[PDB]
From Swiss-Prot:
UniProt tissue specificity: Expressed in all umbilical cord blood, bone marrow and adult blood cell sub-populations and in several leukemia cell lines. Highly expressed in fetal blood, brain, lung, liver and kidney. Detected at lower levels in adult prostate, testis, ovary, small intestine and colon. Not expressed in adult lung, liver, kidney or brain.
Biological classification of the source: Eukaryota, Metazoa, Chordata, Craniata, Vertebrata
PTM characteristics: Autophosphorylated on tyrosine residues.
Source organism (scientific name): Homo sapiens
Entry's family note: Belongs to the protein kinase superfamily. Tyr protein kinase family.
Compartment(s) where it occurs, according to its Swiss-Prot or TrEMBL record: Cytoplasm; Membrane
Parent-protein start and end of this portion: 590 to 665 of 666
Functional summary from the UniProt entry: Involved in negative regulation of cell growth. Has tumor suppressor properties. Plays a negative regulatory role in the Ras-MAPK pathway. May function in signaling pathways utilized broadly during fetal development and more selectively in adult tissues and in cells of the lymphohematopoietic system. Could specifically be involved in phospholipid signal transduction.
Designated gene of the protein: TNK1
Name of the protein: Non-receptor tyrosine-protein kinase TNK1
Subunit structure: Interacts with the SH3 domain of PLCG1 via its Pro-rich domain.
Length: 147
């Protein structure tokens, strides 16, 4: 199952990936309990976190995940989704494509879309309101609902 993108890996897939890596790269044994999480979580760990969890292999595992298996882009997709409620993997990926992988810009664009649908105001108004509220969508969304 590791052929799938890491964002879809289950916790069991993460454990299997570690077993595969230890075999493939002749790593020192990695305890199966080292990363008790799914692939989404794995993508959010920093290199320092990987080194802390695995002093012997953490940097290798991080590089493989982030810079070979597409973790870098998939982490950006997660950031976008976690920043804007109800965005799908596809929607986030598309938004990032539009900004050349710029997470801040993609998030702003999706916030404006979400606010725009909350009321009958123009897209230009939604942009002004969001910028006014320092891009706090929750605060902007409450103003719009209040009318």
């Amino acid at each position: 199952h590791l052929r799938l993108q890491p964002i879809y890996w289950s916790r069991d897939d993460v454990a299997q990936w570690l077993k595969w890596a230890e075999n493939e790269f002749s790593l020192s044994p990695i305890d199966s309990n080292t990363f008790e999480m799914n692939g989404k979580a794995l993508l959010l760990l920093t290199k320092e976190d990987f080194r802390y969890r695995s002093p012997h292999s953490g940097d290798e595992l991080y590089e493989l995940l982030q810079h070979i298996l597409g973790g870098e882009l998939q982490r950006k997709i997660m950031e976008v989704e976690l920043s804007v409620h109800g965005v799908t993997h596809q929607e986030a990926q598309t938004a990032l494509g539009a900004t050349g992988g710029d997470v801040v810009s993609a998030i702003r664009n999706l916030k404006v879309d979400q606010l725009f649908h909350l009321s009958s105001r123009s897209r230009a108004d939604a942009w002004r309101i969001l910028e006014h509220y320092q891009w706090d969508l929750s605060a902007a969304s409450r103003y719009v609902l209040a009318r």
